[PDB]
């Protein structure tokens, strides 16, 4: 009956495509054609952080827009003070191969993970005075690509096993598993209301998940690996930067591909994607060693950061929109403003 | 202009700097190696050999030191077939150790394809490959039976003659070495098809009982370091 099921699936996919085309009366560029362009956005490297020993694979800001955690392949997880360049903590990891770092919203815990398939959650507010591994979540069958905190007790982790997980930290167990993707899930963005999250994988498809219920609501389709994903500040759109030079903006309420940010002079893959606080600027890190700032509505390039000697591997915009921190494969992070 | 607490925080940052400089010296003095191979390939045998004599966990690590030079050798388990995404973590490893079972001719062709994927990878474009054609005690016992001829799996063997080069000095059957050198050349051709800096394949013949594999790794890594010295420092 596999033929019958495949035929029904093909018919359903065609119905989805037809319905999604039936709601595409106008394109985002047509509506945006009248608003004035942003103009040259020239951001300068204010602070440069020079502590790590090897390539930086991830950063994540704190909710205070002051502290930030950076993970390097040297086995270090450095918690930096952005304003003063001071190093607040230097956690030595048990595994040197780290692909993700997460800073809890409360500022108490920080998460790391990588080839070890373990999500290591470290406690920073201990009475002992030193950072300790509070928990080691150990249920994945593939490398961790992204960890994000929901609160102090729940984490959401994307792994190379084609599955995402929602863990209760105290119990140490996977409360929920998300099992739709057909390839390695490389990125993960949590909606501001923390009830949904979009995961981009290597199947050239992003998937929107309901955390509370465990299902996959919508599947958005890119022509290569999706390496970074980031929600729009609204909570009703998101951006996916992929291995084909392209960052695409999708909208949940319409189940569409609103815009495709690409340029003929860009050939490398996007590693990181972030939005400015307003949502008007889409910052994307590239293998070309520089970050491009796109206008998220006119789909035109607005600026270039261009201050790194190796590929930009992580990008993050503070909660207050004050700065965009770029971490590349040279040890350095750069805080642009 | 800093407050008392700000000065104390700066001093703490400088102490962290000091531990980071010590960790930098430790990180530099150690050589990172990545071990790849198939399930058929004798690969845990090699880690056992260089360990004894010198869960769902993903990365397995093996310290071993040769002539006061420390080596961290990493084997990647509990991962799926596709490797194009976690292979980027190894853009800075000194050498990639590829173990290919020379005994199994049927699966040999896919071993060459895996080798080609490793060689022509945009991230390992500057990483040398130390190649171990493993399980050769099984190769001799397989080629001295006549029940499995390479021509049944590689049609070009019938027109291949051993080159006027270094035959195995000890007693070895002259067509055992022919088959061995054909397997070697099938990888050397892929290595030399697209060559660049820091990107040289060192082929070696090994077995399970061989206890000199660590020495071979040290010699090849020394040559890799010499090439990076000749290149980074502009001497070539």
């Amino acid at each position, epitope marked *: 009956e596999l033929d019958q099921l495949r035929q029904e699936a093909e018919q359903l996919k065609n119905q989805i495509r037809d319905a999604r085309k039936a709601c595409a009366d106008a394109t985002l560029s047509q509506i945006t054609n009248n608003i004035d362009p942003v103009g040259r956005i020239q951001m300068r490297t204010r602070r440069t952080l020079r502590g790590h020993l090897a390539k930086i694979y991830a950063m994540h800001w704190g909710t205070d827009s002051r502290l930030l955690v950076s993970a390097s392949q040297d086995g270090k997880l450095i918690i930096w003070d952005s304003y003063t360049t001071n190093k607040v903590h230097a956690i030595p990891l048990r595994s040197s191969w780290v692909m993700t770092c997460a800073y809890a919203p409360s500022g108490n815990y920080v998460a790391c993970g990588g080839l070890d398939n373990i999500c290591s959650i470290y406690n920073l507010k201990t009475r*002992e005075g030193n950072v300790r591994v509070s928990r080691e979540l150990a249920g994945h069958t593939g490398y961790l690509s992204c960890c994000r905190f929901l609160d102090d007790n729940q984490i959401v982790t994307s792994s190379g096993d084609t599955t995402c997980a929602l863990w209760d930290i105290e119990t140490g167990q996977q409360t929920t598993t998300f099992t739709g993707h057909t390839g390695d899930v490389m990125s993960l963005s949590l909606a501001p209301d923390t009830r949904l999250f979009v995961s981009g994988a290597c199947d050239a498809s992003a998937k929107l998940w309901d955390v509370r219920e465990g299902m996959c609501r919508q599947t958005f389709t890119h022509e290569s690996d999706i390496n970074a994903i980031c929600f729009f500040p609204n909570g009703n759109a998101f951006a996916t930067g992929s291995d084909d030079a392209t960052c695409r903006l999708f909208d949940l309420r319409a189940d569409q591909e609103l815009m495709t940010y690409s340029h003929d002079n860009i050939i490398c893959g996007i590693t990181s994607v972030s939005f400015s606080k307003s949502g008007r600027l889409l910052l994307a890190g590239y293998d070309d060693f520089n970050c491009n700032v796109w206008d998220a509505l006119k789909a035109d390039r607005a600026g270039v950061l261009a201050g790194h000697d190796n590929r930009v591997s992580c990008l993050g915009v503070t909660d207050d929109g004050m700065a965009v921190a770029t971490g590349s494969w040279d040890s350095f992070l750069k805080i642009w403003n | 202009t800093l407050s008392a607490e700000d000065k104390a925080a700066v*001093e703490r940052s400088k*102490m962290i700097e000091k531990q980071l400089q010590k960790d930098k010296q430790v990180y530099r003095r150690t050589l990172r190696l990545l071990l790849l191979g198939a399930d058929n390939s004798g690969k845990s045998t090699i880690v056992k050999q260089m360990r004894i004599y010198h869960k769902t966990s993903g990365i397995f690590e093996t310290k071993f030191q040769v002539d006061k030079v420390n080596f961290h050798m990493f084997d990647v388990g509990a991962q799926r077939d596709e490797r194009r995404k976690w292979i980027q973590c190894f853009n800075d490893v000194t050498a990639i150790i590829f173990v290919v079972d020379s005994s199994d001719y049927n699966r040999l062709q896919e071993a060459l394809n895996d080798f080609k994927s490793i060689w022509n990878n945009r991230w390992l474009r500057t990483i040398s490959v130390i190649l171990f054609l493993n399980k050769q005690d099984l190769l001799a016992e397989k080629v001295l039976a006549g029940k499995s001829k390479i021509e049944d799996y590689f049609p070009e063997f019938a027109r291949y003659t051993t080159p006027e080069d270094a035959t195995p000095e000890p007693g070895e059957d002259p067509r055992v070495t022919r088959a061995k050198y054909f397997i070697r050349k099938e990888f050397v051709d892929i290595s030399t098809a697209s060559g660049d800096g820091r990107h040289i394949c060192y082929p070696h013949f090994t077995c399970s009982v061989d206890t000199e594999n660590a020495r071979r790794i040290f010699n090849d890594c020394k040559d890799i370091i010499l090439q990076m010295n000749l290149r980074e420092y502009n001497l070539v």
Partner: single-chain antibody, 230 residues
Framework: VQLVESGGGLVQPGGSRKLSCSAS????????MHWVRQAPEKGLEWVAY????????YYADTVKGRFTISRDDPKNTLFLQMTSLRSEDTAMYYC??????????????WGQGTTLTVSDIVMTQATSSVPVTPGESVSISCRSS???????????LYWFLQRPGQSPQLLIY???NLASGVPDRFSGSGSGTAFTLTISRLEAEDVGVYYC?????????FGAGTKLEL
């Protein structure tokens, strides 16, 4: 965390004595450590400070030259070598734990103290004693001769509580932040040169002497402390 100090007793004037506090239960090597003292019936007075890594040592004016502070990190013990003692140096000496980074809460833990008997941003706390009944809000205020609002943004005032017959316990750090383990009923407020601590719904087991300490510039000055009695 535990931090027990020893070495006190009778010292004839002009003598010398080594006070040693042993720290068990926390990362001693990564914490700056202070020596404070309380006279037989008086307030707290900062004595010395040895930084993490032993790279920054500060002494009080009435202490400088005579006292040498040092730490043995591997053995987890800090020593105050007191030379040429005087009658004014009699006190219960407390060893105070203190880390410094962004968000840190210095002066977290205090030792039980050693009794040693020998045979400047002035901070004023006018209320030397405030009568009170449990269940009612209290306000303890202290001023300063110099504004503590540094240009970076945070005012460096610390409110401590010393229950009868116990070591001081940190209540508020930096004039608005609540320490770890202190009830939410305590609140701190004010501006530079004027600070107020409010206890809403006062509940006994929190009566005792309240001190306010500056941390803008060394030496760290304390106050006389308001004595809340039930």
């Amino acid at each position: 965390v535990q931090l027990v100090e020893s070495g006190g007793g009778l010292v004839q004037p002009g003598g010398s004595r080594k006070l040693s506090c042993s720290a068990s239960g926390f990362a001693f090597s990564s914490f700056g450590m202070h020596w404070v003292r309380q006279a037989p019936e008086k307030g707290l007075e900062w004595v010395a400070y040895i930084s993490s890594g032993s790279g920054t040592i500060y002494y009080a004016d009435t202490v400088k030259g005579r006292f040498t502070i040092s730490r043995d990190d591997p053995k987890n013990t800090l020593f105050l070598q007191m030379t040429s003692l005087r009658s004014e140096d009699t006190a219960m000496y407390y060893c105070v734990r203190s880390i410094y980074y962004y968000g840190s809460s210095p002066f977290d833990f205090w030792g039980q103290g050693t009794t040693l008997t020998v045979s400047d941003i002035v901070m004023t706390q006018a209320t030397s004693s405030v009568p009170v009944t449990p269940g009612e809000s209290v306000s303890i205020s202290c001023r300063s001769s110099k504004s503590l609002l540094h240009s970076n943004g945070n005012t460096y005032l610390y409110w401590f509580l010393q229950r009868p017959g116990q070591s001081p316990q940190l209540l508020i750090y930096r004039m608005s932040n609540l320490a770890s383990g202190v009830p939410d009923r305590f609140s701190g407020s004010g501006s530079g040169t004027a600070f107020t601590l409010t206890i809403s719904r006062l509940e006994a087991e929190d009566v005792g002497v309240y001190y306010c300490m500056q941390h803008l510039e060394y030496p760290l000055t304390f106050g006389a402390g308001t004595k809340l009695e039930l």
